RNA sequence: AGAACCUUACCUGGUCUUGACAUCCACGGAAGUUUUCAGAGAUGAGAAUGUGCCUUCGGGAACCGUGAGACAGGUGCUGCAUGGCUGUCGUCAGCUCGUGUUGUGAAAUGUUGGGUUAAGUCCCGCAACGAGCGCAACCCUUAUCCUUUGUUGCCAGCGGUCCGGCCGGGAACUCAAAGGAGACUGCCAGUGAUAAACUGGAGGAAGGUGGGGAUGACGUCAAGUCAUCAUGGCCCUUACGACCAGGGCUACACACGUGCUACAAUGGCGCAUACAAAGAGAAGCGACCUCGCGAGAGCAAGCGGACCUCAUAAAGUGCGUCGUAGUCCGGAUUGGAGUCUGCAACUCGACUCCAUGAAGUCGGAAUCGCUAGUAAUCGUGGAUCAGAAUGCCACGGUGAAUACGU
């Protein structure tokens, strides 16, 4: 198997915003370089919360909440300084944060 | 009095949130308390303008505000001094320097919150309110949309009990999971205590306005897509 | 039985009162609220008046109590006997 | 009551023999959801039955399941100031399920040092019409032969059918007084 | 055309991955032997029941990888997983195995634990008076 | 609830967080077995009256908006009743109803 | 959702009143930092660094003390004074909006009859008409299946090779998150009043709106929250405010709701053995390391998370062992030491193990959930989370009787 050279990761709460930003990066990486891959989807996280539904009492009835967090990996085999420049000029998303930092 | 509140169940499909940022779990409270602070103090300074929504957005190193209004110029004020004072207190409230752009203005004369504000004023000013809600419902269905519900509370007429009344007309679905449907509940005071108006309005059963991408990966994006299948 | 693990306790509340009381050998019942705090060698021969929540009770400090806390001798709760309920606290 | 006709679950033949009668048996052998043990307890049981007679493994099982079998149940349906009893015919599917249920209730008190031996032994007795569920068959049949005297809310029901362009005989269909 | 033909053994949300080809009747289960995995168990008779039915015990070769389930349950998943892989000795094979029921995916699906209820449907228990 | 009790709770919590990160391996060094005939010194533990409040045992946080004790949720900085009110109004990113 | 202290609504003890904290004003001090000692600590006395900020160079602000006001502050009272919001009936199978008619009108009618449904679904039809709500649906999610990516995923074959995806390398393969594919009582047959609809048929993962979920009308019910939060009425504002500490709601007389685990031998024990899903972890956990009876310990590679760890996942499986004797089940209590999270383990937190060692053998009144991934039963993670899950949330393992009848 591969060893991770650098980690490009997108982390988001919005399921739709991450899908638009990764697709853009995948293009930018082809438009300023030669050695790109289709974005690995990478597994999505979900945190579970339960709270009251009435202001006071009504213990039976309750309410249940989800918050999704979506993770993409892309996996450019080699980023060009131009890929990283382009990525950073054409950034505009809010539902996602992209990390070009590594771990 | 049953049912979950109408915009909270619609957020996973085709309805936006009132805020969209990302904080990498550990900081999510520090961002929420600061985001709540921008909502609470910002709209408080622009009290004298007319407003339908507040949409808060956080790219890297920026907080970008989208704001929704009855007309484009109300929030700008004279020669940009009024809106620069707005970006002034957002930069102060947030942990980063601040941006603002104005949204598309859309259906402002029948819109959920600009109607609800309009009804609350009548009551505020101790006007008789004999027809006022019935004309709210009528003008909104005369200006667009496919159905409205109005429910009015705050001790109607000066009664010494709780006393509500309501009117729904056209089609207003209640358990709907598809399309944006616009709901606002205003809160405002008068002589006998606190009053409030509930405005559910329904424009249409299909809205496309937030989705996951159209296509599988290979036909979308880059021409040369193919993996090596080894070749590290 | 449960204990105090490994670490070092002198208590801040007792420390300034006890240094000046050992210089006296012993002085007047020391108005103490620190009923969470253990008994130590430095305190043997002192008189610690231990607030129980309503008022202080004087505790005589000596070698047979050094395994023990000021809160174990100064009470809180009440046990209702059942001829007729209990008025009083028990030491 | 009840808007439309509703079905039933179906047991599907077991993986070691290909029998519905074996797979329904292990199911009523299940204790605290722990089926893989009730599986061992059935297969070891079936082998002990093969040491008692080797021509078939089911020898005592099948014949217990004819001999401790209920044909009848008692239901009650008030006639005024009294309840009474009215005997009813059971369907074969419940006829069996009652027999199998009494067979395992009977295996769990034999007190022998493994359930594979208990269950083989309580079938061996109940096969000869000597075991524990003979009594349960007899008592339920004594009430069903005796309580043929009484019937279901006759006096008003009989009229409730005669007037609705039904017959001068009790119609066996929903939300009519029967 | 392939090196081993393949069945996915989907049974009650557990998956038996199962690779079939013609050979001498041989088994590898979880990079190890049958003795190891199903040691002194009825579970060896579970996987054999469909293979004995098409009478090819000493004829089919196999390689078996499995994630999820209980051990007695995994054997049960394999019992559909071998017959999923078998499709091409003859064309009718996958039809007649579906008709015997060993292609058929366990159509019962999970029910979520519900909010305000102590299980999936189990509403609370209270005597409260 | 009361604002004096909320004012107190909020003051405990910034020094809890401040002090305890820097004490992460200090508990083992000044107190446990690594302090074998080492440290354990009255002369550094006569300094702990300011740190009574700065303790991990007071790192219970409670609400960031209100300072109200009990039933807290650290990830919103809100509590049960107060999360739901905000989730209704769309204030919280990613928050939806669950169905599955 | 994790009540020792902080957690405080309660209670007791110290202590001041524009007041903990903001704005505004006047005087002194920079705020900040470091430090001994009396006092519980607030607070007070002394030490040492600094003298920033703006400047009619007066002086002020930031912040801290002092004072005047305006004022902050209050889970402080009132739920037939409220708003915001939500519970019940009940998945009842009905309820309402626009309008006309009939009655003098309240009001009816529709919203009612028959047949059928999950359904105001649909055949027929009356002064009810036209239409919406519930329901049906898009919907998420599962499930095959088509479908793409191809890693921190995967490995039919192939190379290095102990034959381990570790790596050269490979796409048959689950597999992740996502476009979605399919199913409509539509079809064909029987039934059914013509008919909706049910059930069979068949290909398929699947037939019955494919499993599951979201899902819950108008609104009485005088339901319930002033205590998230809004607020008139309405009270204190040397305080129903506020700094600082210790104590409690987990007491103890008892009754009672709930769950866990056991009462066995379908099991408990020892040794050995197997496969998870999903997610959380930077005050934290953590391989290897050495230490300890064990619990733990101190050291530390590493961990944006299919990268490392939590994690040994258990039930299940193997083998041997046990006999109604409270044992070979169950092992509680408590003395004592060893250990832990914490300046504090005593009443209100966790564990080992030494010594001794009980209740419980299916439980009276009472008492509930279920139509199938359901009930039943086992373990795991997470929300909260210094310490403490029997609970809650959700996940994956194993998984049932029967639905004749009203």
């Amino acid at each position: 198997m591969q060893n991770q050279r650098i980690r490009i990761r997108l982390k988001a709460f919005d399921h739709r915003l991450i899908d638009q930003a990764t697709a853009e990066i995948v293009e930018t990486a082809k438009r300023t370089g030669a050695q790109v891959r289709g974005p690995i989807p990478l597994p999505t996280r979900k945190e579970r919360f339960t709270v009251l539904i009435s202001p006071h009492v009504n213990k039976d009835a309750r309410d249940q909440y989800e918050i999704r967090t979506h993770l993409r990996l892309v996996d450019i085999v080699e980023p060009t300084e131009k890929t990283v420049d382009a990525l950073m000029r054409l950034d505009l998303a809010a539902g996602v944060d992209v990390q070009i930092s590594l771990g | 009095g049953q049912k979950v509140h109408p915009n909270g169940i619609r957020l996973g499909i085709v309805k936006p949130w009132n805020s969209t940022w990302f904080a990498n779990t550990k900081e999510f409270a520090d961002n929420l308390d600061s985001d709540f602070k921008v909502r609470q103090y910002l709209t408080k300074e622009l009290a004298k303008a007319s407003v339908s929504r507040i949409v808060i957005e956080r790219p890297a190193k920026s907080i970008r505000v989208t704001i929704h209004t009855a007309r484009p110029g109300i929030v700008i004020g004279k020669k940009g001094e009024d809106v620069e004072k707005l970006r002034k207190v957002v930069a102060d409230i947030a942990g980063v320097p601040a941006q603002i752009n104005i949204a598309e203005v859309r259906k402002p004369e029948l819109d959920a919150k600009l109607v609800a504000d309009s009804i609350t004023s009548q009551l505020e000013r101790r006007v008789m309110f004999r027809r006022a809600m019935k004309r709210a419902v009528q003008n909104a269905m005369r200006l667009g949309a496919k159905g409205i519900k109005v429910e009015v509370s705050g001790r109607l007429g000066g009664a010494e009990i709780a006393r509500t009344e309501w009117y729904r007309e056209g089609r207003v679905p209640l358990h709907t999971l598809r399309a944006d449907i616009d709901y606002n509940t205003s809160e405002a005071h008068t002589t006998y205590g606190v009053i409030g108006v509930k405005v559910w309005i329904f424009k249409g059963e299909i809205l496309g306005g937030m989705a996951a991408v159209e296509q599988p990966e290979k036909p979308a994006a880059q021409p040369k897509k193919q993996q090596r299948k080894g070749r590290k | 039985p449960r204990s105090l693990k490994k670490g070092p306790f002198i208590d801040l509340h007792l420390l300034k009162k006890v240094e000046k009381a050992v210089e006296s050998g012993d002085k007047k019942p020391l108005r103490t609220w620190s009923r969470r705090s253990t008994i130590f060698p430095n305190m043997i021969g002192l008189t610690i008046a231990v607030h129980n929540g309503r008022q202080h009770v004087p505790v005589f400090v000596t070698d047979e109590m050094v395994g023990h806390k000021l809160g174990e001798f100064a009470p809180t709760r009440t046990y209702r006997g059942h001829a007729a309920d209990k008025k009083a606290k028990k030491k | 009551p009840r808007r439309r006709v509703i079905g039933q679950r179906k047991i599907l033949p077991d993986p070691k023999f290909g029998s519905e009668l074996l797979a329904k048996f292990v199911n009523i052998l299940m204790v605290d959801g722990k089926k893989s043990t009730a599986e061992s307890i059935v297969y070891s049981a079936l082998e002990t039955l093969a040491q008692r007679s080797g021509k078939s493994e089911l020898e005592a099982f099948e014949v217990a399941l004819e001999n401790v079998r209920p044909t009848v149940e008692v239901k009650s349906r008030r006639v005024g100031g009294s309840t009474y009893q009215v005997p009813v015919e059971v369907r074969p599917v419940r006829r069996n399920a009652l027999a199998m249920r009494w067979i395992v209730e009977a295996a769990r008190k034999r007190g022998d040092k493994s359930m594979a031996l208990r269950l083989a032994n309580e079938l061996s007795d109940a096969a000869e019409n000597k075991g524990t569920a003979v009594k349960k068959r007899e008592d339920v049949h004594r009430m069903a032969e005796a309580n043929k005297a009484f019937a279901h809310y006759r006096w008003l029901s009989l009229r409730s059918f005669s007037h609705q362009a039904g017959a001068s005989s009790k119609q066996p269909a929903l939300g009519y007084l029967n | 055309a392939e090196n081993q033909y393949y069945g996915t053994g989907r049974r009650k949300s557990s998956a038996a991955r199962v690779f079939i080809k013609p050979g001498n009747g041989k088994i590898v289960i979880n990079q190890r032997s049958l003795e190891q995995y199903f040691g002194r168990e009825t579970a060896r008779m579970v996987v054999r029941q469909p293979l004995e039915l098409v009478d090819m015990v000493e004829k089919l070769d196999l390689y078996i990888t499995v994630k999820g389930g209980g051990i007695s349950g995994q054997a049960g998943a394999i019992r559909h997983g071998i017959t999923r892989a078998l499709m091409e000795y003859d064309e009718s094979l996958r039809s007649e195995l579906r008709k015997a029921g060993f292609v058929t995916r366990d159509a019962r699906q999970v029910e979520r634990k519900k909010v305000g209820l102590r299980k999936a449907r189990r509403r609370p228990q209270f005597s409260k008076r | 609830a009361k604002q004096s009790m909320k004012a107190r709770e909020v003051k405990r919590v910034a020094l809890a967080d401040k002090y305890f990160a820097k004490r992460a391996e200090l508990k083992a060094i000044i107190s446990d077995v690594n302090a074998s005939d080492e440290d354990r010194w009255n002369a550094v533990l006569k300094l702990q009256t300011l740190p009574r409040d700065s303790s991990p045992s007071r790192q219970r946080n409670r609400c960031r908006q209100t300072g109200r004790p009990h039933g807290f949720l650290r990830k919103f900085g809100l509590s049960r009743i107060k999360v739901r009110e905000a989730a209704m109004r769309g204030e919280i990113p990613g928050l939806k109803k669950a169905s599955w």
Side-chain angles (χ1 to χ4, degrees):
Chain A
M1 297 204 64
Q2 274 80 20
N3 292 275
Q4 288 294 135
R5 66 298 292 146
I6 181 161
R7 285 85 175 190
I8 293 306
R9 51 292 179 113
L10 288 72
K11 323 181 252 61
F13 288 96
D14 291 35
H15 90 282
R16 52 265 210 185
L17 264 293
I18 180 165
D19 298 328
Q20 297 182 21
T22 190
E24 200 177 281
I25 280 166
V26 159
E27 209 75 71
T28 291
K30 193 53 57 190
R31 286 182 297 156
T32 53
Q35 188 72 9
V36 194
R37 274 170 174 160
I40 297 74
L42 194 77
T44 286
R45 287 173 159 221
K46 288 177 173 191
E47 211 168 293
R48 293 65 71 149
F49 299 86
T50 199
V51 304
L52 205 57
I53 192 158
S54 189
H56 222 101
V57 83
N58 308 91
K59 178 273 197 177
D60 79 295
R62 283 195 214 289
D63 178 87
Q64 170 75 15
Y65 293 136
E66 193 174 71
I67 199 186
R68 294 183 194 170
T69 294
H70 307 259
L71 308 178
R72 261 82 194 152
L73 172 54
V74 177
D75 209 86
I76 322 179
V77 222
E78 180 206 82
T80 326
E81 183 176 54
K82 301 305 177 166
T83 298
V84 157
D85 169 51
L87 178 170
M88 186 172 193
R89 296 172 311 97
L90 299 177
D91 182 80
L92 73 195
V96 65
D97 182 48
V98 56
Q99 280 197 3
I100 75 172
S101 70
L102 75 179
Chain B
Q2 249 61 83
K3 308 194 302 304
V4 72
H5 179 105
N7 295 336
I9 182 150
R10 279 175 194 127
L11 303 176
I13 62 304
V14 306
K15 191 183 179 286
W17 294 265
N18 201 267
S19 181
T20 54
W21 53 253
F22 182 98
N24 208 347
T25 310
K26 271 164 275 181
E27 215 188 27
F28 183 119
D30 185 343
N31 279 241
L32 189 76
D33 278 85
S34 158
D35 181 82
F36 184 79
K37 192 47 166 69
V38 184
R39 183 164 296 117
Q40 186 57 279
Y41 196 62
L42 195 62
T43 71
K44 167 183 184 70
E45 199 94 58
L46 68 82
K48 73 283 184 206
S50 296
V51 47
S52 62
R53 216 181 188 218
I54 172 67
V55 157
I56 309 182
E57 306 188 336
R58 289 173 168 172
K61 298 193 191 168
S62 275
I63 170 181
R64 171 186 319 168
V65 187
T66 309
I67 194 163
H68 295 250
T69 57
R71 71 163 290 269
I74 194 78
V75 85
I76 295 302
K78 65 301 191 176
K79 300 319 185 269
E81 286 281 280
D82 200 291
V83 78
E84 181 49 55
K85 236 294 185 174
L86 295 180
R87 182 192 299 195
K88 192 199 294 184
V89 307
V90 176
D92 303 343
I93 287 160
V96 300
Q99 289 81 10
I100 168 169
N101 77 69
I102 70 170
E104 184 65 301
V105 171
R106 79 304 196 271
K107 59 163 187 159
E109 298 301 278
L110 57 147
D111 150 282
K113 191 182 188 307
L114 274 170
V115 179
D117 305 321
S118 213
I119 288 163
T120 44
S121 189
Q122 301 280 109
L123 291 140
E124 187 181 63
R125 295 175 283 122
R126 195 66 173 94
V127 170
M128 87 291 178
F129 208 69
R130 212 205 45 169
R131 198 193 294 126
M133 64 186 299
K134 182 179 278 302
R135 179 194 190 268
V137 158
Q138 204 167 6
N139 179 218
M141 282 314 273
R142 287 178 308 199
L143 296 171
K146 287 169 182 170
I148 192 180
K149 161 172 72 280
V150 184
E151 318 152 81
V152 301
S153 289
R155 300 180 55 167
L156 309 167
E160 200 64 47
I161 73 163
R163 171 44 68 197
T164 190
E165 192 178 282
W166 112 111
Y167 187 14
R168 49 198 176 112
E169 180 157 88
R171 175 149 184 132
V172 176
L174 298 180
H175 89 261
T176 20
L177 263 295
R178 203 74 154 175
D180 170 44
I181 291 164
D182 305 85
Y183 183 96
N184 178 254
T185 303
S186 168
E187 188 158 51
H189 181 83
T190 201
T191 54
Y192 49 59
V194 174
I195 72 163
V197 173
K198 288 165 280 169
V199 174
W200 199 323
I201 195 162
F202 162 92
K203 49 174 314 79
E205 51 64 59
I206 180 64
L207 198 70
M210 286 295 204
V213 290
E214 290 52 64
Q215 273 178 354
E217 312 192 11
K218 165 145 274 299
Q222 57 174 355
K224 191 189 189 182
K225 184 55 164 192
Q226 296 86 264
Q227 209 240 331
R228 284 77 202 175
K229 293 189 181 289
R231 320 306 181 135
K232 276 63 175 144
Chain C
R2 298 196 288 239
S3 293
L4 51 47
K5 203 191 60 181
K6 206 64 73 53
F9 185 40
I10 203 61
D11 206 77
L12 249 294
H13 316 67
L14 293 188
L15 170 60
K16 284 209 172 294
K17 291 279 280 177
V18 170
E19 283 166 284
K20 189 75 35 186
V22 299
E23 181 176 69
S24 291
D26 184 50
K27 69 186 188 156
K28 53 174 195 186
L30 303 161
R31 300 182 66 197
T32 281
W33 289 268
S34 72
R35 63 171 296 323
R36 315 171 55 61
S37 191
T38 318
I39 292 170
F40 302 126
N42 42 263
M43 298 172 29
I44 301 166
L46 306 186
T47 27
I48 320 301
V50 182
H51 201 73
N52 57 226
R54 183 48 166 170
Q55 98 305 123
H56 302 272
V57 65
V59 195
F60 300 100
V61 193
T62 195
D63 57 359
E64 70 189 296
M65 303 172 169
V66 174
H68 303 293
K69 295 180 70 140
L70 288 161
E72 280 190 67
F73 296 104
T76 49
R77 298 194 182 163
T78 312
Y79 181 100
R80 174 167 77 253
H82 54 69
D85 68 280
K86 222 177 187 295
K87 289 295 180 270
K89 306 306 171 53
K90 49 188 146 54
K91 179 195 180 197
Chain D
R2 293 184 163 271
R3 293 192 181 278
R4 83 287 91 198
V5 54
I6 44 44
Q8 181 189 13
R9 194 266 165 140
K10 177 171 195 296
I11 319 89
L12 293 180
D14 88 301
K16 207 202 174 189
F17 292 100
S19 187
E20 191 196 57
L21 268 174
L22 297 177
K24 189 158 179 195
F25 198 50
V26 95
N27 281 3
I28 68 73
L29 190 67
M30 197 185 71
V31 278
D32 295 281
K34 302 178 169 197
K35 173 68 44 61
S36 182
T37 73
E39 282 195 279
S40 175
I41 291 302
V42 105
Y43 299 144
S44 312
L46 266 47
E47 194 37 263
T48 305
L49 287 180
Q51 299 289 302
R52 297 172 191 240
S53 174
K55 70 186 182 58
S56 186
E57 65 161 40
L58 309 187
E59 208 270 303
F61 155 84
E62 293 280 87
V63 184
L65 291 190
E66 308 300 272
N67 299 359
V68 304
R69 198 180 207 155
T71 52
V72 283
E73 66 165 2
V74 300
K75 184 178 179 162
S76 68
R77 294 184 66 147
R78 296 57 184 179
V79 191
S82 297
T83 178
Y84 313 131
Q85 304 273 358
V86 66
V88 214
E89 291 306 317
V90 181
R91 290 213 305 187
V93 192
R94 177 75 272 167
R95 286 198 177 154
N96 176 56
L98 289 166
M100 286 191 175
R101 281 273 190 214
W102 297 343
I103 279 161
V104 171
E105 176 155 65
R108 277 187 296 232
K109 64 165 168 192
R110 299 299 307 244
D112 323 316
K113 299 183 174 196
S114 181
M115 191 52 197
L117 317 179
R118 288 194 297 187
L119 181 74
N121 184 21
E122 177 51 36
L123 289 166
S124 209
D125 295 299
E128 285 163 279
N129 193 250
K130 304 187 184 163
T132 300
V134 184
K135 304 306 299 188
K136 300 167 190 168
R137 201 205 66 221
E138 193 67 80
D139 294 19
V140 160
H141 283 205
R142 271 166 184 169
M143 286 180 266
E145 196 170 71
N147 304 4
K148 296 188 171 174
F150 293 117
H152 52 274
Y153 185 81
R154 72 173 67 91
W155 73 99
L156 188 40
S157 67
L158 197 68
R159 310 306 320 236
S160 195
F161 300 124
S162 291
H163 86 314
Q164 58 186 150
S168 303
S169 284
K170 293 182 165 188
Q171 327 181 264
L174 311 162
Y176 321 126
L177 287 157
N178 189 5
Chain E
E2 55 190 298
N3 296 340
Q4 283 176 127
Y5 291 90
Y6 179 70
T8 186
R10 304 289 286 93
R11 180 204 73 87
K12 201 175 89 49
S13 313
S14 200
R17 321 168 55 239
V18 184
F19 291 98
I20 68 100
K21 65 180 178 272
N24 311 241
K26 295 185 279 188
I27 289 290
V28 187
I29 184 172
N30 292 71
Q31 305 85 257
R32 295 173 292 195
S33 55
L34 190 55
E35 289 306 294
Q36 189 288 308
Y37 196 82
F38 293 171
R40 288 51 64 175
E41 206 189 356
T42 191
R44 280 183 199 165
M45 295 63 217
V46 170
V47 294
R48 288 296 186 281
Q49 211 61 47
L51 181 58
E52 198 168 275
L53 227 64
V54 303
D55 206 70
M56 285 169 77
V57 203
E58 75 286 320
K59 294 177 161 78
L60 193 68
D61 172 64
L62 307 97
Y63 178 94
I64 297 163
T65 305
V66 46
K67 69 187 70 181
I71 197 68
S72 44
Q74 286 181 88
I78 290 153
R79 194 185 183 226
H80 312 153
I82 296 170
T83 52
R84 286 181 155 288
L86 287 163
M87 67 166 97
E88 59 290 277
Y89 284 106
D90 55 287
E91 295 302 90
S92 188
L93 194 54
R94 197 73 166 279
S95 190
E96 166 276 306
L97 298 152
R98 197 192 49 44
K99 279 177 166 179
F102 303 128
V103 177
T104 302
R105 166 51 207 175
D106 191 47
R108 300 172 305 220
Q109 303 322 329
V110 190
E111 190 170 306
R112 68 175 198 154
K113 196 185 192 206
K114 243 170 308 171
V115 60
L117 302 195
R118 287 199 176 136
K119 208 164 184 292
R121 300 198 205 242
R122 182 183 176 91
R123 306 172 288 141
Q125 186 191 301
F126 282 100
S127 312
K128 61 213 170 159
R129 215 57 56 139
Chain F
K2 296 194 193 174
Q3 177 71 78
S4 46
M5 170 290 235
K6 294 159 170 169
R8 283 180 285 174
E9 184 62 69
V10 171
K11 186 272 178 179
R12 300 324 173 255
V13 157
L15 306 169
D17 283 6
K18 188 72 165 196
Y19 188 78
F20 188 40
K22 315 177 59 192
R23 188 168 190 84
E25 221 179 62
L26 181 56
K27 251 280 190 182
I29 289 167
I30 195 175
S31 278
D32 298 277
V33 177
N34 186 278
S36 56
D37 42 278
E38 173 168 74
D39 212 287
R40 299 180 173 212
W41 282 330
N42 174 263
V44 299
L45 298 170
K46 62 187 182 179
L47 304 171
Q48 292 292 334
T49 173
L50 179 61
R52 190 184 304 127
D53 302 86
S54 314
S55 288
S57 57
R58 305 186 190 196
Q59 199 186 81
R60 304 298 277 160
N61 188 359
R62 308 310 191 184
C63 290
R64 284 185 167 100
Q65 199 61 255
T66 28
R68 166 69 201 146
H70 309 112
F72 179 48
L73 298 171
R74 212 187 275 262
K75 294 305 177 76
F76 313 108
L78 301 187
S79 62
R80 282 173 102 105
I81 181 175
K82 192 181 191 57
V83 174
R84 179 191 84 223
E85 189 54 38
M88 293 151 44
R89 260 60 142 88
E91 311 189 62
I92 298 183
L95 200 306
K96 56 190 64 187
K97 197 63 186 68
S99 61
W100 192 95

